[PDB]
Design a protein around this ligand. Structure first.
Ligand SMILES: [Fe+2]
Ligand SMILES: [Fe+2]
Lengths: 127, 127
């Protein structure tokens, strides 16, 4: 079944600032507002649709598989933003990257506390 | 940038039952457990990784673009499960489908309250 994940909603205090944060960090573009959402289209057919939140925002986890050249570019923008990054999902190792599955990866936070991850090889792969 | 959304985490009371629920309803398969996660691979390169939750589960929204033939099949399974479905995201119209953008769509809930949506044409399209 040619099923695709088409979108998920990302709760945000400032949906426009939060969508721009993700779009800028990943080298993508923000879409025009659609209803109450600010969508960010990810190239594999799914959009992260930012919605103004009320009350506490439960942190979600969004992990992006990126090319090695994109890893270097994204990593540059993270450092330029003065953001702490971590090798590990539990944030024990700030200022380091992991090398899972022969790739490279790191975790960081968006303005709402969502846990963003970049990785260059799929979990459990290596070739 | 060939960036892909690779995975997100889905909080669940019973990660195995919840992953099986989604896999069965969409006609997909559940992957072997990886760490604490039960992944469900969606064909466009993203997995929904089910994780045992503690405390309240904040409902998330996962929308799947499906073929028209898959819509009929999935809709059949929803009815066979005795699940209420709704035309609208606010759940005002039970037992009806929407026809957004010349397609067909409906909303329903997973065992944790996550808001699942199926649609056959992308939001804002029609051709
Ligand atoms: Fe991850
Ligand atoms: Fe939706």
């Amino acid at each position: 079944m040619t099923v695709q994940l088409n979108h998920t909603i990302v709760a945000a205090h400032d949906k426009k600032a939060s969508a721009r944060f993700l779009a800028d960090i990943l080298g993508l573009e923000v879409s025009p507002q659609y209803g109450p959402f600010i969508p960010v289209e990810i190239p594999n057919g799914v959009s992260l649709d930012y919605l103004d939140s009320r009350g506490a925002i439960t942190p979600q986890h969004y992990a992006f598989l990126v090319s090695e050249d994109d890893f270097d570019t994204i990593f540059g923008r993270i450092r330029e933003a003065g953001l702490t990054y971590w090798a590990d999902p539990y944030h024990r190792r700030p200022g380091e990257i992991n090398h899972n599955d022969g790739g490279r990866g790191a975790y960081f936070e968006d303005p709402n506390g969502h846990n963003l991850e970049i990785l260059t090889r799929p979990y459990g792969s290596g070739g």
